[PDB]
Design a protein around this ligand. Structure first.
Ligand SMILES: Nc1nc2c(ncn2[C@@H]2O[C@H](COP(=O)(O)OP(=O)(O)OP(=O)(O)O)[C@@H](O)[C@H]2O)c(=O)[nH]1
Ligand SMILES: Nc1ncnc2c1ncn2[C@@H]1O[C@H](COP(=O)(O)OP(=O)(O)CP(=O)(O)O)[C@@H](O)[C@H]1O
Ligand SMILES: Nc1nc2c(ncn2[C@@H]2O[C@H](COP(=O)(O)OP(=O)(O)O)[C@@H](O)[C@H]2O)c(=O)[nH]1
Ligand SMILES: CC1=NN(c2ccccc2)C(=O)C1
Ligand SMILES: CC1=NN(c2ccccc2)C(=O)C1
Ligand SMILES: [Ca+2]
Ligand SMILES: [Ca+2]
Ligand SMILES: [Ca+2]
Ligand SMILES: [Mg+2]
Ligand SMILES: [Mg+2]
Ligand SMILES: [Mg+2]
Lengths: 438, 425, 352, 54
């Protein structure tokens, strides 16, 4: 068994992770007070769920996670919520004033005074691990912390844990749920300083999660609670291979091995289905060919874009529930003859399939209905390049006038790091076009 | 606990801040004795932003009343919410400022400034994590304008990393106390361009024309004007006083609202503004048409003449946050030629469940428009009309000022208008 | 008050639509770089499709289908037909074509020579035509050596297809001609055929013994108006509309435009568009698409309709601009952004 | 349509299906950027105090 440490940076990172560890305890049968009746090995053991949870002498199953925020309001929710007895105070770290949506404030000014503290707390968790696999970093591109302090943490993690793997769960900024303006700057700044240090990042667009809350769940004004409960459902499907028995995506190394051929192009796309409203009278259960066939509809993409005009480099199908391999192959064959699935010539045209018989656990009193079989597809598509273009265009429209550049320059940062990072993104879009277009 | 230190200076600064504390004390459910008597926990959620917690569950506003004469503060202490304030936060002299910017900034005000900064230090030291300072005052008098700017110059020196917002009432010959109001304004405007992160411009002519014409008030008075500013100040501070998805501090708000360090002068608006047909529930489309209407703005500037860099609207009351996104996203896509197309998504909206006292719903408007240059153009005109003849300068040269410093304040404000201009094209 | 943008100042078709929209008083044009819009009249090449459908509270519509160039490129179409099962390589209405890359850059040079050598081996016609998307650049010749050499002198992709040696000829005149149909595809993928069409004829008698003087062979409206000497003799601007042509088919051949040609044009159009539907549709997309096409057809002496190419940015006839543009607004735009007949189109039903 | 590497266990199974064959900064350097930034804040804040001094 090899452990996996979780790190949540910023409000988005903290809240999301908080909903995740709620879903984890329900999926593994872990009570709010930490007790796990099914766990017969008391005080220790090398089971598949122990990669996320540790065990005390008193039978308390504690997560291997860390919550870091520069303002205490969001983390105090964890210090007093339903699952307050899970974490101990070491894992919850809070500053006093935030980075005011400023990246320079999260990377330099403020982050400099707390960076050593977070590493010391992450160290304590690594000291319990017999074989640390790496870290999963949850953060937002928009926040000053999730963008600024995250990159600084990532840069350090590569120094103290060189051979370890680091995955990301990044919240891509959507103006529909955000009242900020300087988000395009933070995003391009955090992606330039974290690129060489992240082995695989899964982007979630608040705009995509938002619509799925209105179109499928019939929620007129989705809140962060609605958005988080859905995001954690995807986080669960992508991390169950590390928390259960199986052979597909068993350790963090296999995420890059299976999903990332080229180093800089490490941004898969996530597609999930079904998403049914609990308020519905009652839904006819979809077949395996139906939920699988839905993994190609944009409405169920964690990032809005058109893969029909891109090329694939990898493709994983993580099923959960009543799914048999026979049905997966048939559904796959039918999808090829109808869909446009163009792979790159230097990669085989294939799919890696993983099946977990436990259906998706739904939070009691939640927005999602209980389904008999759900699937989450991960696929490295050059179509995801659409997301970098939109964000780059906004960076240019503002930077062309130096709008807001003084708040950043006023925290010690140099203006060159704006064009220095923008030049890098211009290269990233250049790599996607070399691999997808003719 | 993100505390804010409130300073109100001068006759206007105190009379307005007095009603301000009288307005938000009612929303948070705090009687004139500091006792809480509300029925909702949202009232106490972020209550420590403006109120300190004393013994016996008493809530004492974190304000510092400043003036160089006793009159205006004798009425506050003995007025409606006079007892709520801290008895020691009353810092005042006896000579007065004689509506002279030099007496508040260089001579009389300089003699008292130290004792005020000592009170500020008592309120700041006990702050768990200070957000910043907000100052209410007028820019056409002596104390608030003169000593107010001095008090800002000395607060940044001791707190160079704290945010500083001002509610600055601009003078207007249509509602004029003295003829030297252009001078006192031009001198402070440069101090605000330098040492303030956010200045809300509140023209008295707009406030007067808003009462006379819209509110059908035949004979407006200073009190009636202060009612508007009270409702407006309450509106813009909602994000910092009540909870919800919108978690914000002054720096977080200033970062998204001020694209250039010197163009931080906001012109606010409020709705509804109904005369006594006053109980008719105002539809969402009605609040959004007035809130974006020139007649409903308090800077006396025609927005259609300039361009918006950023615009924020905050609604209050139990309404449809879905229809809200619709009506706002309507006015934008119907009058977009007035928004700069190089700041993506500059128009944003928030919703608060707690409405002002006695309103099904309201809407505050916080605009950062280049059209505010019209406000600095009228001042500069009235200034030059007198300064060219050196009229009334003896009140100032007698206090120790040179004519050179007047020519500088003029040139500094003319640059401000030039800087606002290049962004309008 | 709807909002739109104009990013193609050269589109005569959508310069007229933009004028009508403003004439209704309920549309407001913005700067070509303003993002808050409902309808975009984008550019031809490199249209930023990736930025659409991302403005909150804005339903957005564009006048192009992303990926439709598969049907509007010389070589791209010959490849689509041969590789798409919906069309197969034995396509009956598309002249036997071959994609030929110059020797200075797959390539069907050998497959072409295999078919060219069997025609000459059976005393059959062997007149081929060379042409590329990089033309204003066409060569007609019965010699395979002159064709492949004319392509080596170029530097782009050329296509060599069989030249119809027996095209239908109008009378009097003994002259060649082509047919241009305008198809409008809305956002629901309903295929609308314009009831009106144009015949771009040649004012020179067709001569099957001289392919050098390319005037009596290429019926382009720009080649007859520059190299021909009988322009405007038989019909104005070498444009014969369906009324007079349908009137000619009844006098000389004893048939009707609908039965002998229009039934096939109404069939070729359905085939080309339904084929690429699974690739270019915007049914479940975040934005919406719609585009006007220009189907060029050949008609031989046996009253058979052939498909030459499909224009993506097609111009319209001077006498049909007003009627067709008004229809574009009624069906393509007003259906999406309604306002506050007897359709000029012939809807071609199909199975989505 | 070839299925390879079929691994079965108690709580699931995994496999691969092939349809068609194929056709850093050190710690010294990170301390300089952070301190270099800390110096430009000291510099700017120094100018501010020297400006308020005048
Ligand atoms: N999906 C989702 N997005 C969130 C959530 N909370 C915040 N966001 C998004 O995150 C962005 C704001 O950045 P934050 O992460 O909240 O800011 P931060 O990380 O705390 O950094 P600072 O505020 O500068 O201290 C906005 O785009 C929000 O839409 C959440 O709970 N779920
Ligand atoms: N296989 C073929 N058989 C007979 N004639 C042909 C032919 N291919 C092309 N032509 C002639 O060439 C003309 C079309 O030329 P082509 O379409 O290749 O150039 P172009 O695309 O610039 C003209 P358009 O404006 O219609 O797109 C037709 O008028 C037709 O008479
Ligand atoms: N809205 C409003 N404006 C005021 C009030 N009192 C004074 N003013 C304005 O402020 C200016 C005079 O400033 P003043 O209050 O005397 O400043 P002070 O000398 O520091 O007390 C005049 O131009 C008035 O228009 C008030 O109660 N309400
Ligand atoms: C007081 C302040 N209120 N605000 C503010 C800005 C936008 C919306 C709501 C509030 C500031 O920036 C300073
Ligand atoms: C309400 C709020 N409006 N805003 C805001 C910010 C930038 C532009 C427009 C609006 C806040 O920060 C909080
Ligand atoms: Ca155990
Ligand atoms: Ca590494
Ligand atoms: Ca004295
Ligand atoms: Mg934050
Ligand atoms: Mg006075
Ligand atoms: Mg052409």
């Amino acid at each position: 068994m090899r452990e996996c440490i979780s790190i949540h940076v910023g409000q988005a990172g903290v809240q999301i992770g908080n909903a995740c560890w709620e879903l984890y305890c329900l999926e593994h049968g872990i009570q709010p007070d930490g007790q796990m009746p099914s766990d017969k090995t008391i005080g220790g053991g090398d089971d598949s769920f122990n990669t996320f949870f540790s065990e005390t002498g008193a039978g308390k199953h504690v997560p291997r996670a860390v919550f870091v925020d520069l303002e205490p309001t969001v983390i105090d929710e964890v210090r007093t919520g339903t699952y307050r007895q899970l974490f101990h105070p070491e894992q919850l770290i809070t500053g006093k004033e935030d980075a005011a949506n400023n990246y320079a404030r999260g990377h330099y000014t403020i982050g400099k005074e707390i960076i050593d503290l977070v590493l010391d707390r992450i160290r304590k968790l690594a000291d319990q691990c017999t074989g640390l696999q790496g870290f999963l970093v949850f953060h937002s591109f928009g926040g000053g912390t999730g963008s600024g302090f995250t990159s600084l943490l990532m840069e350090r993690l590569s120094v103290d844990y060189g051979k370890k793997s680091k995955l990301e769960f990044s919240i891509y900024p959507a103006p529909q749920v955000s009242t900020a303006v300087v988000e395009p700057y933070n995003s391009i700044l955090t992606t330039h300083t974290t690129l060489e240090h992240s082995d695989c990042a899964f982007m979630v667009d608040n705009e995509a999660i938002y619509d799925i809350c209105r179109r499928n769940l019939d929620i007129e004004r989705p809140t962060y609670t609605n958005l988080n409960r859905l995001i954690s459902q995807i986080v669960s499907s992508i991390t169950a291979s590390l928390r259960f028995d199986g052979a597909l995506n068993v350790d963090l190394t296999e995420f890059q091995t299976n999903l990332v051929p080229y180093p800089r192009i490490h941004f898969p796309l996530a597609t999930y289905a079904p998403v049914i409203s609990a308020e519905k009278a009652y839904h006819e259960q979809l077949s395996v060919a139906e939920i699988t066939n839905a993994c190609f509809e944009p409405a169920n993409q964690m990032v809005k874009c058109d893969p029909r005009h891109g090329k694939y480099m990898a493709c994983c199908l993580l099923y959960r529930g009543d799914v048999v391999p026979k049905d997966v192959n048939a559904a796959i064959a039918t999808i090829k003859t109808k869909r446009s699935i163009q792979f790159v010539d230097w990669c085989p045209t294939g799919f890696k399939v993983g099946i977990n018989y436990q259906p998706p656990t739904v939070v009691p009193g939640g927005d999602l209905a209980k389904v008999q079989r759900a699937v989450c597809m991960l696929s490295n598509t050059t179509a995801i390049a659409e997301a970098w273009a939109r964000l780059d265009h906004k960076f240019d429209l503002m930077y062309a006038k130096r709008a807001f550049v003084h708040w950043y320059v006023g925290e010690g940062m140099e203006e060159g790091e704006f064009s220095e990072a923008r030049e890098d993104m211009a290269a990233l879009e250049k790599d996607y076009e070399e691999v997808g277009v003719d | 606990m993100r505390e804010i230190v409130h300073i109100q200076a001068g006759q206007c600064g105190n009379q307005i801040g007095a009603k301000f504390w009288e307005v938000i004390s009612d929303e948070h459910g705090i009687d004139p004795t500091g006792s809480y008597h509300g029925d909702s926990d949202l009232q106490l959620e972020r209550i420590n932003v403006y109120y300190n917690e004393a013994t016996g569950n008493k809530y004492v506003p974190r304000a510092i009343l400043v003036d160089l004469e006793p009159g205006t503060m004798d009425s506050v202490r003995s007025g409606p919410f006079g007892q709520i304030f801290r008895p020691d936060n009353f810092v005042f002299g006896q000579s007065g400022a004689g509506n002279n910017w030099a007496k508040g900034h260089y001579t009389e005000g300089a003699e008292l400034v130290d004792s005020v900064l000592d009170v500020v230090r008592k309120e700041s030291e006990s702050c768990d994590c200070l957000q910043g300072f907000q100052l209410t005052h007028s820019l056409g008098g002596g104390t608030g304008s003169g000593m107010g700017t001095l008090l800002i110059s000395k607060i940044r020196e001791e707190y160079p990393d704290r945010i500083m917002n001002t509610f600055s009432v601009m003078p207007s010959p249509k509602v004029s106390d003295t003829v030297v109001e252009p001078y006192n304004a031009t001198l402070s405007v440069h101090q605000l361009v330098e040492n303030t992160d956010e200045t809300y411009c509140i023209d008295n002519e707009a406030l007067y024309d808003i009462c006379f014409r819209t509110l059908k008030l035949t004979t407006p008075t200073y009190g009636d004007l202060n009612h508007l500013v009270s409702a407006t100040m309450s509106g813009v501070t909602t994000c910092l006083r009540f909870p919800g998805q919108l978690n914000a501090d002054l720096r977080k708000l200033a970062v998204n609202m001020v694209p250039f360090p010197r163009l931080h002068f906001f012109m606010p608006g409020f709705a509804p503004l109904t005369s006594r047909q006053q109980y008719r529930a105002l539809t969402v489309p009605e609040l959004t048409q007035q809130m974006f209407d020139s007649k409903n703005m308090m800077a006396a500037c025609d927005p259609r003449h300039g361009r918006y860099l950023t615009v924020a609207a905050i609604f209050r009351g139990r309404m449809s946050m879905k229809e809200v996104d619709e009506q706002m996203l309507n006015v934008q896509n119907k009058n977009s030629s007035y928004f700069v197309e190089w700041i993506p998504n500059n128009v944003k909206t928030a919703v608060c469940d707690i409405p002002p006292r006695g309103l099904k719903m309201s809407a505050t408007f916080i605009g950062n428009s280049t059209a505010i240059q019209e406000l600095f153009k009228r001042i500069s005109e009235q200034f030059t009309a007198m300064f060219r003849r050196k009229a009334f300068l003896h009140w100032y040269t007698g206090e120790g000022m040179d004519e050179m410093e007047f020519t500088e304040a003029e040139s500094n404000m003319n640059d401000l208008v030039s800087e606002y201009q290049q962004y309008q094209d | 008050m709807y909002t739109f943008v104009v990013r193609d100042e050269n589109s005569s078709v959508y310069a007229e639509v933009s004028r009508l929209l403003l004439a209704t008083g309920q549309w407001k044009r913005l700067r070509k770089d303003n993002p808050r819009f409902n309808l975009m009249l984008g550019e031809r090449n490199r249209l930023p499709f990736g930025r659409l459908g991302h403005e909150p509270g804005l339903v957005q519509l564009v006048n192009y289908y992303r990926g439709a160039d598969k049907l509007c490129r010389k070589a791209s179409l010959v490849k689509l037909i041969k590789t798409s099962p919906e069309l197969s390589e034995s396509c009956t209405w598309f002249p036997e074509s071959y994609v030929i890359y110059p020797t200075n850059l797959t390539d069907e040079r050998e497959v072409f020579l295999a078919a060219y050598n069997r025609r000459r081996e059976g005393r059959e016609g062997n007149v081929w035509i060379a042409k590329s998307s990089a033309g204003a650049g066409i060569l007609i010749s019965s010699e395979a050596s002159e064709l492949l050499d004319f392509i080596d002198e170029q530097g782009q992709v050329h296509v060599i297809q069989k030249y119809l040696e027996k095209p239908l000829l109008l009378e009097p005149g003994h002259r060649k001609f082509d047919i241009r149909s305008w198809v409008l595809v809305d956002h629901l993928y309903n295929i609308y055929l314009y009831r009106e069409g144009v015949l771009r004829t040649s004012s020179e008698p067709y001569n099957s013994a001289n392919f050098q003087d390319k005037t009596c062979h290429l019926t382009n409206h720009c080649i007859q108006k520059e190299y021909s000497k009988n322009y405007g003799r038989y019909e104005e601007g070498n444009e014969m509309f369906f009324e007079e042509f349908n009137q000619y088919l009844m006098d000389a051949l004893n048939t009707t435009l609908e039965n002998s040609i229009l039934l096939q044009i109404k069939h070729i159009i359905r085939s080309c568009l339904m084929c690429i539907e699974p690739a270019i549709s915007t049914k479940h997309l975040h934005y919406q698409s719609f585009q006007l096409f220009g189907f060029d057809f050949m008609v031989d002496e046996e009253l058979k309709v052939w498909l030459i190419e499909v224009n993506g940015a097609p111009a319209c006839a001077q006498k049909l601009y007003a009627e067709l543009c008004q229809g574009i607004v009624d069906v393509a735009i007003s259906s999406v952004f309604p306002l506050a007949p007897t359709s000029i189109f012939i809807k071609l039903h199909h199975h989505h | 349509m070839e299925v390879i590497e079929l691994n079965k266990c108690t709580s699931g199974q995994s496999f691969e299906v092939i349809l068609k064959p194929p056709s850093d900064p050190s710690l010294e350097e990170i301390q300089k950027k952070l301190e270099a930034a800390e110096e430009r804040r000291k510099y700017q804040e120094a100018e501010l105090l020297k400006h308020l001094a005048e």
